[PDB]
Design a protein around this ligand. Structure first.
Ligand SMILES: COc1cc(-c2cn(C)c(=O)c3cc(C(=N)NC4CCS(=O)(=O)CC4)sc23)ccc1OCC(=O)NCCCCCCOc1cccc2c1C(=O)N([C@H]1CCC(=O)NC1=O)C2=O
Length: 114
């Protein structure tokens, strides 16, 4: 009883979460472990929240899903300093994670891999 967009975003979410083996983006960030986050980050986002929107069919497109992934990465680079594991990890997986999802859609339009 699954949905085509569900199965595709479960695949994408799996691929990206492998680039965070310690789960720094697995759960919503709380002020207990990040003082002031509630006040500096107006729209928080995490891998766990994206999974719930997948399960609840709240994504109508791949673009909506990519916006939540970028916002989660952008939040981590706003609230944290550049010399932090959170900034470095969020910078690497944001980029590596966009190309990864772009090269999989791109091979369907290329004459050699279609
Ligand atoms: C690392 O802290 C966290 C960080 C973040 C986070 C995020 N982002 C994005 C951020 O952007 C961000 C920014 C942050 C911040 N404050 N930065 C400052 C830095 C300096 S500045 O830049 O100047 C100012 C700003 S924090 C943060 C968020 C949350 C975090 O979490 C907190 C925490 O500690 N939970 C506790 C949960 C348990 C932890 C250990 C997990 O353990 C488990 C869990 C489940 C199951 C098992 C285990 C386990 O051990 N086992 C063993 C048992 C034995 C066995 O038989 N087998 C096993 O496997 C299990 O079964």
């Amino acid at each position: 009883e699954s949905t085509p967009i569900q199965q595709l975003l479960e695949h994408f979410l799996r691929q990206l979460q492998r680039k965070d083996p310690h789960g720094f983006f697995a759960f919503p960030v709380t002020d207990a472990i990040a003082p002031g986050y509630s006040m500096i980050i107006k729209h928080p986002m995490d891998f766990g929240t994206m999974k719930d929107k997948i399960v609840a069919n709240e994504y109508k497109s791949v673009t909506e899903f990519k916006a939540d992934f970028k916002l989660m990465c952008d939040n981590a680079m706003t609230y944290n300093r550049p010399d932090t594991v959170y900034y470095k990890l969020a910078k690497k997986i944001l980029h590596a994670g966009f190309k990864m999802m772009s090269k999989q859609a791109a091979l369907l339009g290329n004459e050699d891999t279609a």
